[PDB]
Design a binder for this molecule. Structure first.
Ligand SMILES: OC[C@H]1O[C@H](OC[C@H]2O[C@@H](O[C@H]3[C@H](O)[C@H](O)[C@H](O[C@H]4[C@H](O)[C@H](O)[C@H](O)O[C@@H]4CO)O[C@@H]3CO)[C@@H](O)[C@@H](O)[C@@H]2O[C@@H]2O[C@H](CO)[C@@H](O)[C@H](O)[C@@H]2O)[C@H](O)[C@@H](O)[C@H]1O
Ligand SMILES: [Ca+2]
Ligand SMILES: [Cl-]
Length: 325
C-alpha cells in the first residue's frame, strides 16, 4: 500500500516526463528498489559502464554532479555538452543530479571547495543582498539554471538532489538550520523563476534533523547517505526512522558505500526507493585502463553488485518502462 505517499510533485505544472517518473517511483514503493551509480566525479556514466562489465546489467539511474560550475565551460568540462545525459536518457535510463556547490576558499581565491574545513565561505553573508558572497551564489544559480534548462528543453526530467547532508555540518551550507532553509528556498524560487518544471526535488536527511527540513512546498523525496554500515538491521532502523518522520514521501538511499548487501537490507525491511553507490575515482576514471577490469571497488565491488542484481526486488535499466511519449 502506497496511499500515504503524496501523489503530486511539489512543483506546479511539473513536466509530463517528470510526472511519469514520479508516478512510476510511487508505484514501485514497497515493492521494488531502483539501482543507481554515480558519475566518476561529474559528467560521464563511467560507473554505469563498469557495473555492466562486472554484471551484464546497467543500473536504472545514472547521477551527474554540477560541482564544476567555476571551471565550466572549459575544454575538460562543459555542462552545455549534454550529450552524455541525453544518450543515457535515450537508452532508457533515469537521470539524476547532485551538486557539490564549490565556492572560493577565500575572497578572490581561484580555488573552489565545499567543505567547511577547506573554505571560509559564510552562508550568513551569502544571504545578505549584494555582498560578495551573495553575488557569487546568485551567479552560480543563474549559470546552473541555464545548464538545467538545456535538459528541460530536451524534455529530460532530473531527480535533483542539491544541498545535501546539511545537518552533518561539514559543508559550508550546514552552518545552521535557519540559514540552510533560507538557502534552499532561494534555490527553489530561483529555479521556478527560470521555468524549471522538470525537477524532482530530493532532500537529504541525516535522520532526526526535522529542523533542517526545508518544508513540503520545496521537497518531493527524502534521501539518506550512509557509508561503512554493514549491519542490515542498522540500515533498516534508519529506513524506518525516516519513514516515521516523513510518512508521505519516498525514502531513498541516495549515497552508499561499504554497506550490507541489498539482499540483507531487504530481508531486514529496508525497502529504499533506490540506492546509489558512490564512485571510486581511480578505478572508473578511464574506461580503457587495466584497473577498470579488476572488479575491485572501494564502495561496491563486483560481488556486491552481482548480489544486488540477483534479487527480485531490484530494478536494472532494462526493467524500466518507457518514460517518453
Ligand atoms: O576548477 C576548480 C576546481 O579544480 C579542482 O578540481 C578539478 C579536478 O577534479 C578532480 O576530481 C576531484 C574533485 O575535484 C573533488 O575534489 C572530488 O571530491 C570528492 C571526494 O574525493 C569524495 O569522493 C567525496 O565523497 O566526494 C567529492 C565530490 O566528488 O575528488 C576528485 C578526485 O580527487 C579530477 O576530476 C581532475 O581531473 C580535475 O582537474 C582537471 O583535470 C583535467 C585533466 O584531468 C585538467 O585538464 C584540468 O585543468 C583540471 O585540472 C578542485 O579540486 C576543485 O575543488 C575546484 O577548485
Ligand atoms: Ca562557470
Ligand atoms: Cl540492463
Amino acid at each position: 500500500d502506497n496511499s500515504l505517499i503524496k501523489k503530486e510533485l511539489c512543483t506546479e505544472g511539473a513536466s509530463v516526463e517528470a510526472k511519469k517518473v514520479y508516478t512510476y517511483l510511487r508505484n514501485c514503493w514497497g515493492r521494488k528498489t531502483l539501482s543507481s551509480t554515480m558519475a566518476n566525479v561529474t559528467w560521464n556514466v563511467n560507473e554505469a559502464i563498469w557495473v555492466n562489465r562486472q554484471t551484464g546489467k546497467y543500473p536504472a539511474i545514472a547521477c551527474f554532479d554540477y560541482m564544476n560550475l567555476p571551471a565550466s565551460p572549459a575544454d575538460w568540462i562543459d555542462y552545455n555538452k549534454i550529450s552524455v545525459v541525453e544518450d543515457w536518457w535515450n537508452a532508457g535510463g533515469l537521470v539524476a543530479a547532485c551538486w557539490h556547490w564549490n565556492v572560493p576558499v577565500t575572497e578572490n581565491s581561484s580555488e573552489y571547495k565545499c567543505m567547511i574545513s577547506e573554505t571560509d565561505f559564510d552562508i550568513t553573508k551569502a544571504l545578505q543582498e549584494g555582498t560578495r558572497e551573495n553575488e557569487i551564489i546568485k551567479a552560480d544559480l543563474e549559470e546552473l539554471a541555464g545548464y538545467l534548462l538545456l535538459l528541460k528543453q530536451k524534455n529530460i526530467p532530473v531527480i535533483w538532489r542539491p544541498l545535501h547532508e546539511a545537518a552533518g555540518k561539514w559543508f559550508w551550507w550546514g552552518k545552521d538550520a535557519a540559514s540552510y532553509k533560507r538557502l534552499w528556498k532561494l534555490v527553489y524560487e530561483t529555479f521556478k523563476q527560470k521555468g524549471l518544471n522538470n525537477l524532482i526535488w530530493v532532500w537529504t536527511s541525516e535522520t532526526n534533523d526535522r529542523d533542517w527540513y526545508p518544508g513540503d512546498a520545496y521537497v518531493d523525496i527524502i534521501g539518506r547517505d550512509v557509508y561503512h554500515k554493514t549491519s542490515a538491521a542498522g540500515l533498516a532502523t534508519d529506513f524506518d526512522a525516516l519513514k516515521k518522520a516523513f510518512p508521505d514521501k519516498l525514502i531513498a538511499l541516495s549515497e552508499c558505500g561499504d554497506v550490507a548487501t541489498i539482499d540483507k537490507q531487504l530481508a531486514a525491511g529496508a525497502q529504499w526507493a533506490w540506492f546509489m553507490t558512490w564512485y571510486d575515482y581511480e578505478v572508473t576514471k578511464d574506461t580503457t585502463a587495466p584497473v577498470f577490469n579488476s572488479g575491485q571497488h572501494e564502495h561496491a565491488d563486483k560481488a556486491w553488485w552481482n548480489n544486488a542484481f540477483g534479487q527480485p526486488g531490484v530494478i536494472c535499466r532494462s526493467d524500466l518502462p518507457s518514460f517518453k511519449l
